């Protein structure tokens, strides 16, 4: 039960500060340094800094966030922390802590090795001015412009909600074959949007009802939207 347990995800306003905790369980806390790493949408992992746990507790920071980040540990509660101030939209990311010998102690059989071997579960920080809002669910109706011979495509546009996530199913879970629910995109407005589509036989459009079931827990919004062929 060697583990690192992080605090829960948070939505923060631009300019605000946030503190993420990293509690160590199942090992001798002072024997390992702690790193902070983040990964933002569409980018690779970024090292942010480390805390010299067991060697005085000073922090070393990466240059990108230097001047507005603080990292500390508490030996008594075997917990490490990262505080990021003056938050910007670009700080939206998942933040991880990790433990590491970092060449400090003579681990028997391994030596003064370097390797981030245990990781926290991640903490998602969303930096946004947006208010919580449920989606507007629009039909993506099947038509001739969405028919491939014997196959038709239809869907739901799940637009203008905040924050993530929504969940989507079709026909209360009875329809799964051919369903693609896309990752959300962040619109220039600051609200998220996604589509969910399904391909079905064209011949089924007159006989089978298609309903997308959308749930947005953050805003207590539930939607069951019937998608029907274009009125001709």
């Amino acid at each position: 039960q060697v583990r690192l347990v992080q605090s829960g995800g948070q939505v923060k306003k631009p300019g605000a500060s946030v503190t993420v905790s990293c509690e160590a369980d199942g090992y001798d806390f002072p024997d390992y340094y702690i790193h902070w790493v983040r990964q933002a949408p569409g980018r690779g992992p970024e090292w942010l800094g480390l805390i010299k746990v067991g060697h005085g507790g000073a922090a070393i920071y990466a240059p990108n966030l230097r001047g507005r980040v603080s990292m500390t540990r508490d030996i008594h509660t075997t917990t490490a922390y990262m505080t990021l101030q003056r938050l910007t939209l670009d700080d939206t990311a998942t933040y991880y802590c990790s433990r590491d010998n970092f060449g400090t102690r003579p681990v028997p059989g391994r030596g003064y090795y370097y390797g981030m071997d245990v990781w926290g579960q991640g903490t998602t920080i969303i930096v946004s001015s947006a208010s919580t809002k449920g989606p507007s669910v629009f039909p993506l109706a099947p038509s001739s412009k969405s028919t491939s011979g014997g196959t038709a495509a239809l869907g739901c546009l799940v637009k203008d909600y905040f924050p993530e996530p929504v969940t989507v199913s079709w026909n209360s879970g009875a329809l799964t074959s051919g369903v693609h629910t896309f990752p959300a995109v962040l619109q220039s407005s600051g609200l998220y949007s996604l589509s969910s589509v399904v391909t079905v036989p064209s011949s089924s459009l007159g006989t089978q009802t298609y309903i997308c079931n959308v749930n947005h827990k953050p805003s207590n919004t539930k939607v069951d939207k019937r998608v029907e062929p274009k009125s001709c």
Partner: protein, 216 residues
């Protein structure tokens, strides 16, 4: 500042095949200071190799690390289904900042498949909102690389579309992609032809799907 490069950018292989992943450094590294990580989307990174060639406890021995100086290799002797993931090398010490390489993604190989393309006009319901969304769907294609261009009355659109792509499908190893064009209702009503032009290597030439506003 150390710079790490990783090749190939992507590998496309079948379960059971050998994978060889390259990591090169801009200056020589001590073998003690090169590590490898596995990452899957939304999950914490996982240490595979530290000190160039050592496995932490629990890592299967199909993962082998080798190399020295500026040239390092991660070998997977026989790919298991769980091994399709992104792999990062890392300069792991002893100075800072610690640098991750750009990553190599190992994807499931399959035959080239052209996308089925579908276009969706905005709903009348949405137009009541003052905004029109036009959606272009590229369905069940391989490989992932695809190009979408939007034209409105043959004017190429710029800055007003967004794309999303699924992960590789568990059953048929394909991808799907959506592109969404956002317009004011006023701009949508001022124009007639809405076209999504798709380029993909499974197509002999680009495919255009279009509709005319107002037609059934």
């Amino acid at each position: 500042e150390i710079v790490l490069t990783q090749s190939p950018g992507v590998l496309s292989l079948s379960p059971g095949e050998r994978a060889s992943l390259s990591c090169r450094a801009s200056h020589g590294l001590d073998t003690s200071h090169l590590a490898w990580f596995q990452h899957k989307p939304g999950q914490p990174p996982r240490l595979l190799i530290y000190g160039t060639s050592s496995r932490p406890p629990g890592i299967p021995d199909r993962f082998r690390g080798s190399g020295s100086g500026t040239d390092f290799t991660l070998t997977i002797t026989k790919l298991e289904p769980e091994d399709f993931a992104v792999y990062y090398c890392q300069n792991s010490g002893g100075g800072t900042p610690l640098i991750f390489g750009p990553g190599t993604k190992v994807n499931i190989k399959r035959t080239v498949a052209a996308p089925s393309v579908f276009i969706f006009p905005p709903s009348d319901e949405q137009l009541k909102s003052g905004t029109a969304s036009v959606v272009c769907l590229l369905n069940n294609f391989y490989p992932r690389e695809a190009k979408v261009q939007w034209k409105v009355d043959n004017a190429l659109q710029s800055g007003n579309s967004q794309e999303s792509v699924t992960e590789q499908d568990s059953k048929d190893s394909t991808y799907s992609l959506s592109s969404t064009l956002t317009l004011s209702k006023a701009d949508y009503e001022k124009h007639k032809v809405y076209a999504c032009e798709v380029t993909h290597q499974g197509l002999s030439s680009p495919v255009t799907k279009s509709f005319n506003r107002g037609e059934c």
